[PDB]
Amino acid sequence: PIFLNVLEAIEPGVVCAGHDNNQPDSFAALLSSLNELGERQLVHVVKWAKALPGFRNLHVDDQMAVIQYSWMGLMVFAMGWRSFTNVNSRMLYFAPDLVFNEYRMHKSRMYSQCVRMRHLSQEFGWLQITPQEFLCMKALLLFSIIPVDGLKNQKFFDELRMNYIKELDRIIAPTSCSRRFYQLTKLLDSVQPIARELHQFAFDLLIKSHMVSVDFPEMMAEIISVQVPKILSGKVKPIYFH
Numbered sequence: 001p002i003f004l005n006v007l008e009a010i011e012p013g014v015v016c017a018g019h020d021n022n023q024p025d026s027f028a029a030l031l032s033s034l035n036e037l038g039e040r041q042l043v044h045v046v047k048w049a050k051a052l053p054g055f056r057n058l059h060v061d062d063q064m065a066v067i068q069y070s071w072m073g074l075m076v077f078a079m080g081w082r083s084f085t086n087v088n089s090r091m092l093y094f095a096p097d098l099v100f101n102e103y104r105m106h107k108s109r110m111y112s113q114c115v116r117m118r119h120l121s122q123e124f125g126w127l128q129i130t131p132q133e134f135l136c137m138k139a140l141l142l143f144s145i146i147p148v149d150g151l152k153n154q155k156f157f158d159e160l161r162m163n164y165i166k167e168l169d170r171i172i173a174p175t176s177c178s179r180r181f182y183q184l185t186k187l188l189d190s191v192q193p194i195a196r197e198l199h200q201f202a203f204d205l206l207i208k209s210h211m212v213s214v215d216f217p218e219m220m221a222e223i224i225s226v227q228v229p230k231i232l233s234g235k236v237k238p239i240y241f242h
């Protein structure tokens with residue numbers, strides 16, 4: 001199981017937010033921690049992506065781009081899985097030290113987005129997603145959002161995406177395989193709308209950060225002000241199965 005051996009070997013370990021849970025919840029503190037957690041997670045997402053089979057087949061300029069565009073979606077999918085495996089979807093497990101109950105979902109002003117992520121988390125259980133299906137689907141998510149004007153070398157990207165779909169095919173393997181593929185691709189598509197709502201929220205917050213006492217880390221601020229608007233303005237779009 002060469003491919004799956006690799007995906008398991010490179011899967012990131014636990015990442016903490018550094019949040020002060022021994023203090024009353026406040027919008028400012030909760031979002032400052034979400035931003036810090038995001039910066040911390042981005043570091044791991046980059047190291048993970050660069051270690052994926054065939055990733056070096058991509059043009060160097062397309063490598064960071066694909067990571068930046070897919071970052072939110074990758075985080076959402078992984079968080080949903082952690083929430084399912086750790087707390088049976090009872091709460092959103094952003095990090096061991098940043099678990100969201102409904103009060104925090106409300107305090108964070110990200111309630112609608114959080115409920116959708118809780119639903120995604122429940123889906124992992126309802127569809128009985130296996131750890132191996134999770135790993136392969138998460139990898140495919142990295143190759144699911146591209147620019148309309150094209151990547152430096154679109155062909156290398158198209159080949160890589162096809163190969164990851166083939167690997168998902170193998171993990172699944174007739175009618176039974178078809179039904180499963182339908183379920184998984186539907187689940188994958190469902191991550192994009194959620195990531196979009198989070199992109200919009202992060203963007204709006206960054207623009208008003210100076211007035212809400214929210215602090216934005218260097219790399220995150222860069223992605224949110226440079227890459228995210230490309231997605232929100234329609235220049236960069238997700239690749240839906242359906």
Ligand SMILES: CC(C)(O)C(=O)Nc1ccc([N+](=O)[O-])c(C(F)(F)F)c1
Nearest residue numbers: 034035037038075076079094198202
């Ligand atoms: C508000 C902002 C940009 O900090 C943010 O969405 N942060 C953030 C941090 C971590 C995680 N995570 O999955 O570990 C997520 C999210 F993907 F759940 F939504 C968002």
